[PDB]
Amino acid sequence: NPLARFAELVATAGLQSDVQALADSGADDTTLEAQLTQELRLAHDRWGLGLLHLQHSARLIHTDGVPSDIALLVDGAPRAQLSDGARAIAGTYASMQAPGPEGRSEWGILPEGHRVTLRPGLGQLRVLIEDARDFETHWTPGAAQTWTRTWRQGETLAVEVHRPATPATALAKAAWKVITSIKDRTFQRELMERSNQVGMLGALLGARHSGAGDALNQLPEAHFAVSSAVVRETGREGREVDRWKAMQREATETLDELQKAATRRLAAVLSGGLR
Amino acid sequence: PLARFAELVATAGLQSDVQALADSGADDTTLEAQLTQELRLAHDRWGLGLLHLQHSARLIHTDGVPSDIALLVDGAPRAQLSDGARAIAGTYASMQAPGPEGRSEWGILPEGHRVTLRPGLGQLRVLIEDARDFETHWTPGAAQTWTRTWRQGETLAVEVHRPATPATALAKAAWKVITSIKDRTFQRELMERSNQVGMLGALLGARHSGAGDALNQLPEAHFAVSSAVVRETGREGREVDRWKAMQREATETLDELQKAATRRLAAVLSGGLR
């Protein structure tokens, strides 16, 4: 019951959760909570809320054995629970954010220090990757509505690739996919006409049964979207620039695929689901 | 006491202000802050390679009243000024890790990556402007010197080091005296003996008989200047033009101290030690 709710939450970040399979295979609570933490941190790398300076963890909440809820922890303290619902969890994470005027996160990933303003070369990054210790770059454009940054913390080189997406943005792209794929022309004309009045999602929810938008609201797909992708590298490959170039290229392909897979899975919910 | 501390840091070319500070009305924390500041400046110039350790000085109280100065490493009392400069020099030498070429092997920062500089300032420009904490290996310069650069926190720092032991400095000052002898016959005699007993031994053999043991009492026979460190904080620690002035300042300080140490050492071995 509790694990299934967690698997549905992190599937909005593209994860297939292993926690129910580990619980059925005899793992204890320490192994389960380590996997819960692993999947929560991978989901926050992809949700892109700008909370990389915080430490995320999960713990099980039992009631006479028998897991009943999952506590979501930030820096060792519980801040939300899975029973709270998807809107309440996303609102707890939203009160931790600091957007700028262009919507991106203003927090540094590292503790408060010098962040690099990258000028149009690769010579700054070559010395920071090869020769430096902990460093962190500011956002720089990566094209295709994509913004990117690179940081080292200890032995771990990391790169984030970010394209901004809200759940309303992600559902609107899925609503456009369903409406454009409508076979009869007269029916899609009135939905395009209705999209000008109530938006694309509300026009597509007008062709479903009453309460489908209420059923969509209880889903984590209405409150969580993929906007980032993070690739990390530890050890000797962390100081090579050709590894970092393969890291950013991995994160861009991972971000583009996770957002396109989001568009299909949301369009299937708007067309066939919400029952 | 405070005078033995003043003689200890004078081997690093410092004129101590703790006696004038204590003659005026000043409390124990004011003295200990000035004692710590002069101790850290002395270790910058001594060049023992102990920059990874935190150095401090605290007054030792005898029945609640100060009586001696403890020398602390990482919060632990390890030495005291009443033991003399030989015991202080041996205590830090037990902490010391000398390399094969007269340089420290340990890093100043905690154990991590250190930069091997290529020729130029392409690496150091990004490291000074854009990076956080970093550390450079030794890179050579003119007149047998070696340089390294590091940032810790908001503090940029550069070190110019020329390897100098007190045995090297006493031999260098012995050559200063012998080459200034008017008699070419008496100069030939001293250098022919220096091949057997060394330059300092040959000079002390041609003085009074108690000159060697009087040299050992001096703190100059146990500490020598081998480095010079210049530091910068704030946003000017991320300017390259400040850094060029920094290792210029450190090279000129190292050269001025090592020539003033050779001169005052030569005056001790000639007419002093009585």
Automatic annotation (TrEMBL), chain B:
One of its GO terms (molecular function) is aspartic-type endopeptidase activity. It comes from the Bacteria. Keywords: Plasmid. GO terms for biological process: proteolysis. InterPro entries: Peptidase_A2_cat. Residues 18-32 form the Peptidase A2 domain. This is Putative DNA repair protein PprA. It comes from Deinococcus deserti (strain DSM 17065 / CIP 109153 / LMG 22923 / VCD115). The gene is pprA.
